[PDB]
Amino acid sequence: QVIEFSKYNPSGNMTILVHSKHDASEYASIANQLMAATHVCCEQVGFIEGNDFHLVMSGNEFCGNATMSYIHHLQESHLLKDQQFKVKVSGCSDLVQCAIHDCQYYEVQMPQAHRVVPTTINMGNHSWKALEIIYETYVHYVIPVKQVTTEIQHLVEAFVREQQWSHKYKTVGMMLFDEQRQFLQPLIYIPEIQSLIWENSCGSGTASIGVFNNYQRNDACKDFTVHQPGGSILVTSKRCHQLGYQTSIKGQVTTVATGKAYI
């Protein structure tokens, strides 16, 4: 099978978008073959399907970095001018608010944090204050740190591996945040497969820093820079009375490759 694809770099979290048309029944198999290290290789695969913008993720979840890649493809390939628009994305009940801004910055509305719980977590001989941020299908812990260290990283791995996690949470994020350096070291745990990954960058993790800032200061944040291993992402977040948290991320994306993949 020939697959028409583009590979993109949104802060080091490598994304493929598929341009060619396939049955949704094949997305799982196509994506699994493409993301392999012995193939094109990537972290996430999206399929590009009047209501003309539709992105379907191979797992059918919402992905901010893949949506951001899709916005970039629309600007780059379809020559869209700067504007505010909506996209249909798998994993979302409502259309997602997107924007193309000047200087090729792309803004994506992120899933609403339902509630927050200030907590402390015990790792080793130390306790850390953390903010538990609860979404419909995942949970992030924002853990302020003086500096990220391999010792702390080992402690965090042990913590996620030793804990029992609600089956509500498809992913468990441990977001180590150096507040002074505005630096995020994101860890993603997938309970079902008991696998951990220290991400180059994390759209959803960046969004969680915006909610953390809102809780911590009662201040909105606008274009707050979250530095990460793979680059940086901006977060805009405000609590809007009864409407709750309204959070978006903004970033740049580079196309690294386009052509045909063989599966």
Q: Residue 18 or 74: which CB sits closer to Cl ion?
A: 18
**Subset of residues 168 to 227 that bind a second copy, contact rule: CB under 8 A:** 200
User: Which one among 21, 25, 37, 120 touches a second copy, defined by CB under 8 A?
Assistant: 37
Q: Residue 124 or 259: which CB sits closer to a second copy?
A: 259
Compute the C-alpha angle 130/224/152, nearest 5°.
35
- Cβ atoms 47, 22 nearer than 8 A: yes
Closest CA to 139 of 211, 198, 208: 208
List the x/- string, 220-249, binding to a second copy by CB under 8 A.
----------x-------------------
Strand pairing category for 195-198 and 221-228: unpaired
Q: Residue 162 or 241: which CB sits closer to Cs ion?
A: 162
Using CB under 5 A as the binding rule, whether residue 94 contacts Cs ion is answered as no
**Would you name the residues annotated as active-site residues?**
63, 202
User: Which one among 6, 69, 201, 204 touches Cs ion, defined by CB under 5 A?
Assistant: 204
- Cβ atoms 138, 191 nearer than 8 A: no
Using CB under 8 A as the binding rule, whether residue 257 contacts a second copy is answered as yes
223 contact choice in a second copy, Cs ion, Cl ion, none (CB below 5 to 8 Å, kind-dependent): Cs ion
Smallest distance from a second copy to CB 41, Å: 5
Using CB under 8 A as the binding rule, whether residue 261 contacts a second copy is answered as yes
Q: Which residues of 15-45 are buried (b: 16+ CB within 10 A; e: fewer)?
A: bbbbeeeeeeeebeebbebbbeeeebebbbb
1 contact choice in a second copy, Cs ion, Cl ion, none (CB below 5 to 8 Å, kind-dependent): none
Using CB under 8 A as the binding rule, whether residue 77 contacts a second copy is answered as no
Q: Residue 37 or 243: which CB sits closer to a second copy?
A: 37
Closest CA to 71 of 61, 58, 83: 83
Q: Residue 227 or 238: which CB sits closer to a second copy?
A: 227
Binding-site ranges for a second copy (CB under 8 A): 5, 7, 9, 12, 14, 37-41, 200, 230, 254-262
